[PDB]
């Protein structure tokens, strides 16, 4: 197959920036290269075809170029609606192959997460289950490390993490981490700690609660 590699797998840029995305083929593709845009909602449209022909209805800030095995897609001035995943595809031979895709995000100033932790609700405890939830909200960059500790020992088992897409208005990310135990194991320990490590600080952010602290 002709292997297609997109150089920057993910890219950060500020609105107004000139963005350029690379696509390399394993062998000369004779300019038969098309570009697709996948919006965060999963839908896809053709952007550019035959290396540099613009498809009807697409913004004039998108242009493409290249030859042989090297092609690029350039956004002249990044707009918010351009936040998406872009894919090159070769139409020189079968099977048709696509590049791995390049996802864009808006670059902004760093922002430390607002962390909050929540003890299992009593409704859940009645069912014999126990989930401790920790929200880490509105931070930038996306890279964050969360570790759970129970009486000084660390997490690992029973953790479910989930991230939101970059917020369209303030460009930050949010994350939620949940530690689930049985009611039996929960009631045999005192403290539960959610510990986050982010670029914004040399020392982790720690939020804890003690089971007995019934205020």
């Amino acid at each position: 197959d002709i292997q297609m590699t997109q150089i920057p797998s993910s890219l950060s840029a500020s609105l107004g920036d000139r963005v350029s995305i690379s696509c390399r083929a394993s062998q000369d593709i004779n300019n038969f290269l098309n570009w697709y845009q996948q919006k965060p909602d999963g839908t896809i449209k053709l952007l550019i075809y035959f290396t540099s022909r613009s498809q009807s209805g697409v913004p004039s800030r998108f242009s493409g170029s290249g030859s042989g095995t090297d092609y690029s897609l350039t956004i002249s001035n990044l707009e918010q609606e351009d936040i998406a995943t872009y894919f090159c595809q070769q139409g020189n031979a079968l099977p048709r192959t696509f590049g791995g895709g390049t996802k864009l995000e808006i670059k902004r100033a760093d922002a430390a997460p607002t962390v909050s932790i929540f003890p299992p609700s009593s409704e859940q405890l009645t069912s014999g289950g126990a989930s401790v939830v920790c929200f880490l909200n509105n931070f930038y960059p996306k890279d964050i490390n969360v570790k759970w500790k129970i009486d000084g020992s660390e997490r690992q088992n029973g953790v479910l993490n989930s991230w939101t897409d970059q917020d369209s208005k303030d460009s930050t990310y949010s994350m939620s981490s949940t530690l689930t135990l049985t009611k039996d194991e929960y009631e045999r320990h005192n403290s539960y700690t959610c510990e986050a490590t982010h670029k914004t600080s040399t020392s982790p952010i720690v939020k804890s609660f003690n089971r007995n602290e019934c205020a």
Partner: protein, 220 residues
Amino acid sequence: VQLQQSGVELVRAGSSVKMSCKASGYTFTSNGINWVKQRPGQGLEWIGYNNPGNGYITYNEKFKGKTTLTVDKSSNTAYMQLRSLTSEDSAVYFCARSEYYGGSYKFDYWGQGTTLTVSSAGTTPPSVYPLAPGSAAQTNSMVTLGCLVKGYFPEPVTVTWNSGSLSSGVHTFPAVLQSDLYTLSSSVTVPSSPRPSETVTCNVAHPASSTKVDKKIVPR
């Protein structure tokens, strides 16, 4: 031009599905139809092609055998049949139209895609649990409340706070698959002025099971 998709999506391992892609807005026999697979793990995969005009079909050797492409010219519908379904077949499948441009083709119009979920799970309504700030004074000025929606199937659930009147400060996280069941959560940050002098309730709806649950967040 428009490619409207859909076929069975919630299936069990070992079965087969026949998905459809109905074209409109142009002369169906004039353009070939391609099928593409996209697993949650980012990437796109070309499955095969079918030209309803000349009846030419071609497959990607990978899918050749597990896949059967057919077309019904009378109704302008393209079909793809997957068989011997496994967990690695769970993906979104798109159909796209080919258009000749001097030398090669461009996939110019795409269908919205059909999500194929292979699972053993049965329709199950969620357990909604109110999350009130714990133990010591959790937060100053603003207060963060949450709602844990655990163990439901299938997707999706819709979460709203105060029947939607509370839209600012809310974060609803993408559902995560735990043991073949989904779990998700949502948080809301209100000034210490509102709760608990003012009522905060999380409302979750699960269409698949016709379930609706209202959970008021009250002080621990």
